């Protein structure tokens, strides 16, 4: 029971072609201890900006499904950030960092014609939260087949 | 029965010498029960990494007792080249320099970092300084926990 | 890089296209309810897929094609394709004085022209913003003398910064080879290279 | 949108279809019983599938067609298609005074007219209710002068509000493209876009 | 082995190819980002794939071909194939006086000559360094009289030792058969071994 | 058992082969490293796969062919095939006095001939050792008057005992039906049995 | 049931087969050993597979064929097909005086006649034992006047009881349809059931 607002109810009932966008506010794996530095990724295509930060839109190919039944079950997701982005893979495989903590918040923003249609009644009328969890993640899978296309995806696990 | 001919003696001796590299951390002066730890004759060095004293109750199983010893000193038995070749964890300046271009195309990375890394450890000994009664060793780390985010997470051991 | 065209250099004929396919590649997730409705959600992006097919090439034309494609491949630059299909040269004039408001988004660019643009585009003519590479097709139009509304099918990949300018003419699709993996050309007995087809895709 | 046709704007000939395929898509549950009987139970909907194909299109006609299909795609509104094969202009007259009882249901509409309709619809003529999108085909007819019963193939998805009014001609299928994922436009050497086909489905 | 050709020995005509296909095998990593951009990072190697085909071969010619291919297969040595399409005999002269600086890398070789080479190589002409097997194609050229820079398609697998010397003609593709698993030889009724094709790949 | 040939018995024509395919069936494991190299390891063996096709057969010829093939099946003996392709009848003379050294191995046989063999074989001629069934193809040759070495493509399945003797003439591939599972022959209206094709493989 | 033939009742011409295919189904175990040898062991059975096809059948003759095939299906008895290609009426005479010793086994039957058989069977002529169903083909023959040896392709499934007698003429394959799952009969516009084919297998 998230009240979802009557405006969002009407939009979901009528519009029938809604451009879903996810707002991933990652917290960077940081070493030696400092203030938290956040990378703001989104799936969409343009650059969807919610309440300040711009949420860059050049990564995160897909997001897993949030499967959680009536049993506390370490509810887990998994990003898929392209492994051809030097910055992300570098932050992944740098030796010295530890990221036991570091929140991941995903906002599943229902894009309006021009910029988010104001659901979530208690919160400032923005998108529903989607995960709001912690990052306990894996890493690269490279293929570089000699025949042709190979894939490379960062599988950021989070639970 | 392993016939003692399936072992290569030279690397077995090498790994045994890897085990008994002197631990310049403590001193023999502060070992009260020097004898019942299991080294004879004070003055001699006796400060060796992994100085395990074993009970092998022969009622459990061969498999489980052997894996218990291996978990104790840290290692594995590996009949890869046809010989058992008991290896142990080590650091050395002569490794193999494997470049990615050499291997093949597939390369999996898997950080099991959420569950399998810790900031403080707790241990459990059968201490001769307690008349063979359980004793607990614990640390904390200011570097590690500050690296994490100030999250308390203890490794537990016996 | 301007993939070679007869306009660029006509001394090598036959490098002109014989069939261009604009694949309106619009990855989108479709569900078919038993209610009768179909529900679709737009994620990812839209890339115009260009399917180039070439005729038989004599050694000189194919040598030039290899020169240009290899200079494309060894470099990081992007292939540029001009489609003669849409080079209508309407609007015309200059685009320096026309201005766009602060931030538009949402598939409509409401730009006003003072006196520098003389001509109404037809619905279906390619349109581009100066700063952002990708090419938009106009799908409706309406004018109020100086201010005219323009509606685009791809939903404005870039936002508006306030200095964006239209182009309307000489627009080039930034494209990359999707056939770079296995790009071969059989040289038959006749001495002509055959079966050289290019599958292109934008790198906006 | 009233997908453009020669009826809408005839200045572009060749926008008329060269083949129309009403796929009578009838989802159901079928069990081929070991007895031998086949039992059919109908759930979900009976959505008319239209698979339109086009003749050779010159660039201007296909420019207009792209305009309309892309303004479809950028917006959410449904494609509306008027099939010329069923626009026989029977019945005719006005439909304002045509009345329908409170709640009919059950695939048989008994609509009474005073004198405002002059013409008997024939079995196989498309039928629609003004309020609800879906299009029905008439499968039988019988008249009592002012009151005639009309039997539809789909079983009246919407129940009758009591203000429904038939149309009988110029009825538009609310439809959505099922080919928008990868939509291709090959330009033949002769200068005409060839083999442009559209696959459509209702969204009642 | 210098896979036999009419150039090597012409007493057996028909050993010449009837179709040569340099498959520019360029393995890499490509992700079609949801942004719309395509980012490609190149690892592995850029190995030229040759798919050779032959005319109908009389039993003596194919007997000689079997000899050479089987002395290939029993040995570990590589096939060397000299492509006639790129053997224009440009450049010419001797290559002993040609010098190359210590370490070039980065797909651009600036090789300087005193006067020993008389002729400009053309874009699309095969190029090879004497020490290292793999064959490069030239994609651009410019000269300063004694010092001319040469741009190569592959990114110079071997770094320059400082004693490298170009060849520019008669360069042999060090390659290995990819069809030796099951090699077929059908002798038609007419008496000719027909449809004998070889698929090759370098072993740089 | 010597599957019937026109040389064996010419009174039944059409039992002669219309297309013979020696398949160099060489099972081998190939890895393609990103380094650029390809790595190949030889295990298993080599079996010359013979792909035989027959024309339409009149009842007499097909009755004889069934007689011989059923004699092959009910017995354990191996099919023997003589290929007219390689029956060159070079070398000639007798082979009794020629000696082979004690243990040779390794794909090269160095056999010395005193005066009993008069004629140098051409590279590509089938060669067999007297005691071991499988036939080898020569792929190079060199002679020193009395001692000439022979290089074979298959790597000498048998070792050398010291009494091995060459044959050079009339060597028959030991073969077994790989089509024995479903060996059918359609008797057409024309009265001729058609579609009788044999796929043979050695049982060395 | 004796699937009808023109021999049985000729008033329906066209029930004769247009194509007969004896698939010599020979199940076995084959391992292609790494040595190169192919070793096969024979288990299961050697069941003759008949693949009958018919000319275009008029409604009456195919009505009769349906009668006989459906009377086959409703009962459990096996179809009996007599192949006309092997009914050469050799051997001839009566088969009562022919005797066979106690137990022969092993694919060679040595049957002795006094004088009652007048004619030598030929290799490839079908052979059957009266007591046991399956049909054998003769693969070799030799005679000593009263005692002649006959060699069979299948290895004598039944051992000899000591009272079995050959037939040599009009021998019927006990067979079962493998097209009874879905049997199709298309009535051409011309009035003929066309392309009626049957796939049969022995049920020895």
UniProtKB/Swiss-Prot annotation, chain A:
What does the UniProt record tell us about how this protein is modified after translation? Ubiquitinated by the Bil antiviral defense system when this protein is expressed in E.coli MG1655 strain expressing the Bil system.
Please give the first and last residues shown and the length of the full protein. Answer: 1 to 159 of 949
Assembly and binders:
Homotrimer. Forms a pseudo-hexameric ring. Interacts with distal tail protein pb9 and straight fiber protein pb4.
Q: What is this protein called?
A: Baseplate hub protein pb3
Q: Can you say where in the cell this protein is located? A: Virion
Q: Which residues form a coiled coil?
A: none
Q: What does this protein do?
A: Forms the simplified baseplate, together with the p132 collar protein, the baseplate tube protein p140 and distal tail protein pb9. Closes the tail tube and, upon infection, opens to form a channel thereby anchoring the tube to the outer membrane. These changes allow the tape measure protein pb2 to be expelled and phage DNA to be transferred to the host. Also forms the start of the central straight fiber, which is continued with the straight fiber protein pb4.
Q: What induces it?
A: Expressed in the late phase of the viral replicative cycle.
From Swiss-Prot, chains C, D, E, F, G:
Q: Kindly state one GO CC term assigned in the UniProt record.
A: virus tail
The listed locations are: Virion
Positions of disulphide bridges: none
| Keywords, ordered alphabetically | Late protein, Viral tail protein, Virion
Which InterPro entries does the protein's record reference? DTP-pb9_A-dom_C, DTP-pb9_A-dom_N, DTP-pb9_B-dom
Cited Pfam families: DTP-pb9_A-dom_C (PF21424), DTP-pb9_A-dom_N (PF21425), DTP-pb9_B-dom (PF21430)
Signal peptide boundaries:
none
Residue intervals passing through the bilayer: none
User: What binding partners and quaternary form does the record give?
Assistant: Homohexamer. Interacts with baseplate tube protein p140 and baseplate hub protein pb3.
Task: Report the domain remarks.
Answer: Possesses OB-fold domains probably serving host adhesion properties.
Q: Write out the function statement from the record.
A: Forms the simplified baseplate, together with the p132 collar protein, the baseplate tube protein p140 and baseplate hub protein pb3.
Q: Which protein is depicted?
A: Distal tail protein pb9
